[PDB]
Subunit: 160 residues, 3 copies
Amino acid sequence: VKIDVIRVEIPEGTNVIIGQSHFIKTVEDLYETLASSSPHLKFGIAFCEASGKRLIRWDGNDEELIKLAQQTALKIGAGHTFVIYIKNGFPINVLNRIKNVEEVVRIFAATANPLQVLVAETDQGRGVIGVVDGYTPLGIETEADIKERKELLRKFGYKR
Amino acid sequence: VKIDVIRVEIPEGTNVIIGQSHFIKTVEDLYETLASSSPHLKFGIAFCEASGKRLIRWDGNDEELIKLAQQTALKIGAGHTFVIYIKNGFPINVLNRIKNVEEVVRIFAATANPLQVLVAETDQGRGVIGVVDGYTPLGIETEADIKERKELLRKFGYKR
Amino acid sequence: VKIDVIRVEIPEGTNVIIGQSHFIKTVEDLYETLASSSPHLKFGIAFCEASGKRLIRWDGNDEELIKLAQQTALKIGAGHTFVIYIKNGFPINVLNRIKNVEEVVRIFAATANPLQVLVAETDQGRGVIGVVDGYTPLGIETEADIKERKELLRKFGYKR
C-alpha cells in the first residue's frame, strides 16, 4: 500500500484538531459543542462524508477557519476524517467536548506545531495511519527545566 | 514491516465498531454496557486475548452477530483488538458507553460503509495501524447541500 | 516512509500506558490525576515536548518507573508522545482518568504483554502509527472456556 505524507497548514494564532468520526450528524454536533463552549471561541469545521455524494461537510462561525478546515480535509482525503481549526481559544478548552461527541471515534491530533498526517491509500480509498506532531526529543529536562515549566503554568494562570 | 489490507464484512442492517482494549474483563464489560444501553439492541462481541491461550473471547445476544465479530477479529488477527457488531440500533447509541469502558484503549472505526482495516505485521505479531472508512471526498458542500442535510436530521428526528 | 519496530521494556509487576498529548501542562495533569487516583499507586511519567528545547518532560513518585518512562519515550522518539509506567495498581484503575485529561489526544496502548510501538519516519521527525500488543489469536473460545473466564473474574473479585 502507498503511504503519503500530508503537510497541514497551521496559520499563526490557530490550532488544529484532526480526528475520525461517522454519520453526517458529526457536523452539527461539533458546531454545537464548540459554540456552547465559549462565546468568543472562533472555529471552522470540516467532515469527510464517506459515502453517497462524498462531500466535505462544514460549518463554524469563522469563514477563514472553515476554509482552512476544508482545505486540510481535502489534502488528507480520507473518508470520515474531520478537521477543526480554532482561534481565540486553545485545544484544552474543547478537547474533552470533542472526545464526547457521540459520532466521534477518535482524535488524531490537537496542535499548533508543524504537522504532517500519514495517509495510506488502497484500491478503495484513503485512511489515516498517524501523524508527525512537532519534532523528536533531544534530551531529558533538568531540575532547572522543571522549575521553569512550573513557573510557566503559574504565569499563564493555569496552576497556582 | 509488511502491511495487510483486511476487508471487513458488514451485512445490510448492521454496523461494526472496532477498537483496542486490554484485560480479559473487556468482554463482560462490553457485554454489560451494551445490554443496559437498550432492551432491544442486538449485538455480538469478539476480543483478541493476546497472551496465554490467545483465544478469541466472545459474547452477545445474537448468534449471527457473534459469528461476524469472531470472523472479523480473526481476519484482523491483532492482539487486544475488539470487534462489535450491532443491529436494531446505531453506533451513536453506544459509542460513548464503549469509550468509557475502563479496559478500552481506543476505537479504530464505527461505520456501516465499506471498510478496510490496515494491519502491520512484525516478527512478534500483528497491529492495527488504521482503517479505510468509505471513500475519498469528491468536493465541498454548498449552501443548498447544507439546507438538505439539516432537513435530513430533522426528518429522522435527531434534531428539531 | 520507513517504519521502525520499537520494543518496549516492561518490568515484572508493572504496566505501561503510551499515548499522544499536547502542551507542557500534560505532565502536571497526568501526575495529578494519578496521584489522586490512589494513595498507594506508584508511577513514572514522560512526555515528549515537540518544540522549543524538545525535552523529555517528566514527573512521578517512583524514580525507577520515571527512568523507564524517560528511556521508553526516547526510544519511541515521536513528538508529543507520553509514556506512563505504573506499579502496585492496574491500568483499569486509571485508564479513564488518563482519557479524560484535557491535553490527552489518544492512547496507543495499556498493557503488560510484550509490546512493540510502530514508528513512521519522515523528514520532519517521528510518528506512532500503531502497536503490536501481544500475539495473534490461536482460535475461538468454547462454552467451557467462557465458564472459566467468568469464574476467573469472580476469583479476582472484579465481578460477582
